[PDB]
Design an enzyme around this catalytic site. Structure first.
Site, PDB file in Angstrom:
ATOM      1  N   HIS A   6      48.804 -22.908  77.980  1.00  0.00           N
ATOM      2  CA  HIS A   6      49.207 -21.381  77.635  1.00  0.00           C
ATOM      3  C   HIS A   6      48.225 -20.725  75.884  1.00  0.00           C
ATOM      4  O   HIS A   6      49.015 -20.250  76.044  1.00  0.00           O
ATOM      5  CB  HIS A   6      50.921 -21.908  76.248  1.00  0.00           C
ATOM      6  N   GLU A  24      50.367 -27.990  81.547  1.00  0.00           N
ATOM      7  CA  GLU A  24      49.111 -27.417  80.711  1.00  0.00           C
ATOM      8  C   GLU A  24      48.308 -28.005  80.217  1.00  0.00           C
ATOM      9  O   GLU A  24      47.324 -28.054  79.382  1.00  0.00           O
ATOM     10  CB  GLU A  24      50.275 -27.902  78.708  1.00  0.00           C
ATOM     11  N   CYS A  37      46.904 -25.985  69.260  1.00  0.00           N
ATOM     12  CA  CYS A  37      47.163 -25.630  70.179  1.00  0.00           C
ATOM     13  C   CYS A  37      45.824 -26.206  71.074  1.00  0.00           C
ATOM     14  O   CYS A  37      44.985 -24.652  70.975  1.00  0.00           O
ATOM     15  CB  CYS A  37      48.101 -25.749  71.386  1.00  0.00           C
TER      16      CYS A  37
END
Ligand code: NA
Ligand code: NA
Lengths: 173, 173
Positions: free
Chosen positions: A32, A56, A131
């Site tokens: 993402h 992911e 992230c």
């Protein structure tokens, strides 16, 4: 016991987060955070990159050496229950924030409407811009990477790293 | 520190597994062990029972006292990361096998094709006939139940208990 500068130097700003040089040609990150609509990554056209994505987890294998200064290191699909890892968080300011986490189960988990293959753990916090930061642990004298930061509970104390696809008997399937 | 006989006495053979008397009228179990096609549970017709089911968690509230010898006890939706619980396993032979488990994340996890709201943990093993056994932990001088046994990895060291429905900021959502 602490992550050395060279290991930190693998953590790299990327998209809306970070990624990690596993070797001179292999970069991992969280799906993402990967920029949308681009024709190149790190100046390399997409057709020169082998781009693998599962949930992911994203891996790039570039056709040329992007970080020839680095040795290859081991990437594993998560780690055993109870393994203490360190999430190598860089912040935009330059601050390094290694966070200790005790890892739990590998599973496919629903997160914000999507199924995510990953491993949860308990922080011993993260922010959304973290992230893609790697989850590492030391094995003997070497460091192993086993996931990339993907999610956290609103409290903070539970985190999730995305891990490579693959089935096995220690994971919930 | 050890579960007393009265607490064990709440663990009850049910369907293809077990369930647990939370109080004189409330019984919890794992959905997949609930017998199919029946018109009664414990001799009570279904219309006299309030049957709540969410995923792998099932709760019955009977209209009459089925275990008037018991006090009510607390049922919670799982427990904090790192909580050490005990899975109160009875076997068909009569053997009691309390298993210690260190609990991890509450999440909705894909297990054998189905989404299951539950909490994973690491055994500090189970067999398929153990489903429905309660996960308990001691809080002060009292015991709290927080899940029912639902799944385990093929290795064995990761287990999952189903927990009640409910969102909250400490769970992965
Ligand atoms: Na956090
Ligand atoms: Na087991």
């Amino acid at each position: 016991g602490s992550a050395p500068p060279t290991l930190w130097s693998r953590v790299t700003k990327f998209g809306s987060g970070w990624g990690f040089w596993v070797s001179p040609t292999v970069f991992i990150t969280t799906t993402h955070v990967v920029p949308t609509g681009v024709k190149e990554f790190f100046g390399e056209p997409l057709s020169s990159i082998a781009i693998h994505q599962a949930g992911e987890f994203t891996q790039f294998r570039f056709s040329k050496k992007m970080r020839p200064d680095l040795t290859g290191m081991v990437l594993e699909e998560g780690c055993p229950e109870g393994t203490v890892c360190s999430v190598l968080i860089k912040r935009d300011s330059g601050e390094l924030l290694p966070l200790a986490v005790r890892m739990g189960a590998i599973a496919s988990m629903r997160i914000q409407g999507r199924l995510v293959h990953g491993q949860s753990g308990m922080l011993l916090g993260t922010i959304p811009g973290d992230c893609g930061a790697p989850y590492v642990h030391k094995r003997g004298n070497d460091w192993v990477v086993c996931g990339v930061h993907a999610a956290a509970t609103k409290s903070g104390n539970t985190v999730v790293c995305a891990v490579q696809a693959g089935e096995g008997e220690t994971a919930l399937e």
